[PDB]
């Protein structure tokens, strides 16, 4: 059995879709890609100047793009079907985009869409922001549950349970980083969220784990979830906590989005705000030569433990001849910032390097975040659609023998132009209180999460971009894996073609994750590439989803 596609005898009629729309109170949207304004047909609405506006920031994570119902940010998944950078005469086609989008207002819209889809054998897709690097928030011929507009927030002053007492926030499924930060800040709190401000904090970010510059202080985003409000495949409106539907709670808190249930909201721990120490710390090989530069990168890595165990973090960009780091030091006044940086600066001084060091103390976390990752509120985060990753164990770094292999990996990757420079985050998320969840164990032993990320080139041919896609999956990622035994790959930052996904994403947790999948979705209504239980479905040459 296969899901239906447009053209099939069993594709729902115009009356069937109109019936669904009536049930949804007019909230069904026939998908019109945002870049239809760049083409004359089949939508008649070529607007040359509106098209130039889309070109200007198409490869950036913009609120304008995220606001579009049927769109996705990945240039690879757009796949030239309806894009700004082909000729106006080339027809705008849906390709990987869903055929219809449900503008979800609450639980009933989801229940009605699920029931319709099971009745008519339509593929369900779930999309929040369209950030997903693996194409998991789009799909050909699908009915998409668009969660973007569930923006409600609610401060809970005294959340009270065995697992947590303190302030919390209930956030709707569509709440993005910038909105969560604005809400948390308004009450003098912080929340654990991603570095890219348009990222959907309640969607794939937290559901897949979600690292943060506050992770050394408060753990992974998944660690901070108190409750998940969901709709199951069979339409049940449930709440999953550590003591209620707790197997579902466990799976949702790190098991990856788009497979266990449809999330309507989450409730997450808030944390007391206060001053935040910051710095730019940068150095290069210009005075001292490339070999010493790499020895300095290696020693920088080996000095991180004490810094990270104090609740602090570095997010840094590793280039072939220079490194630029951004330090986050919660509650560190100026004297304390200098004391925390001193070992790093003493080491660089002993190798002949004069670094660029620009410390600061921000009054609150919101200001700190947007000093380095702004401008507020939306940032300017570039979308690199060949994103790979590795969670690297501390033990690899602290043993200078295995750390030499790590440095050799970084040097090798630094020599590949499309994937260089690249960002790394650093964290210690062991030994903190959290409810039991399905985060890969590698997170706990982990110290670095590095994301070599290939850019898209609109002047290249489709075959060249396909070849880069394949290179990332079958050459670069396995090279990263072999250099970092004991690590894992972060399921949110990987290539859709990566063959070893099951082992690297889920490891020993897969058995239990799969039992939760089969319990809450026995008919496999939910599918995402590399998702738990995704092996039930296969995509054929046409993009049709068929049972394996
Ligand atoms: C684009 C981008 C992504 C980033 C950036 N920075 C990050 C960082 O500093 N740390 C991180 O840990 N991650 C970073 N990410 C990655 C994002 O965390 C992931 O790409 C998330 O998977 C994206 O989440 P979301 O914003 O929800 O994007 P979608 O593509 O809409 O969905 C992803 C995935 O999750 C499922 N899903 C979303 N919402 C739901 C609900 N309500 N219910 C069920 N399932 C849901 C989707 O089906 C899909 O599979 C920096 C940048 C620039
Ligand atoms: C972009 O579209 C092309 C087809 O126009 C897709 O090519 C298919 O790729 C798969 C492997 O992923 C092959 O096994 C199929 O034979 C190809 N199909 C055809 C018809 O050539 C390609 O997958 C699309 N890219 C993305 C990222 O969706
Ligand atoms: C659903 O109904 C609304 C309100 O009349 C309409 O604007 C919209 O175009 C309809 N959607 C579809 C897919 O027909
Ligand atoms: C989605 O629904 C909300 C609330 O009903 C509405 O404000 C918004 O304009 C809708 N979006 C689109 C694109 O129709």
Residue numbers in the entry: 27 to 574
Describing publication, verbatim:
In the present study we report the discovery and the structural characterization of two novel flavoprotein oxidases from the thermophilic fungus M. thermophila. VAO-type proteins are composed of a FAD-binding domain and substrate domain. In both MtVAO615 and MtVAO713 the cofactor FAD is covalently tethered to the protein by covalent linkages.
The crystal structure of MtVAO615 with amino acid residues 27–574 was solved in two different space groups. The structure at pH 7.5 contains one monomer while the structure at pH 5.0 contains two monomers. Rcryst/Rfree are 19.5/23.5 and 23.6/28.0 respectively. As already observed by SDS-PAGE, MtVAO615 is heavily glycosylated, showing electron density in 2Fo-Fc maps for N-glycosylation at Asn47, Asn105, Asn129, Asn211, Asn310 and Asn438. As expected, MtVAO615 harbors a bicovalently linked 6-S-cysteinyl-8α-N1-histidyl FAD while MtVAO713 has a monocovalently linked 8α-methyl-N1-histidyl FAD. The groove shaped substrate binding pocket of MtVAO615 is solvent accessible and contains, besides His157 and Cys222 which tether the FAD, Tyr159, Thr221, His237, Thr341, Tyr352, Leu399, cis-Pro401, Ala402, cis-Pro403, Ala408, Phe410, Thr413, Tyr449, Asp451, Leu475 Ala477, Ala479, Glu519. On the other hand, despite having a bicovalently bound FAD cofactor, access to the active site of MtVAO615 is rather narrow. In particular, Phe410 and Tyr449 seem to create a sort of funnel. It is worth to note that Phe410 is on a loop which runs longitudinally across the active site. While this loop is further away from the active site in the other sequence-related oxidases, in MtVAO615 it leans towards the active site contributing to narrowing the cavity.
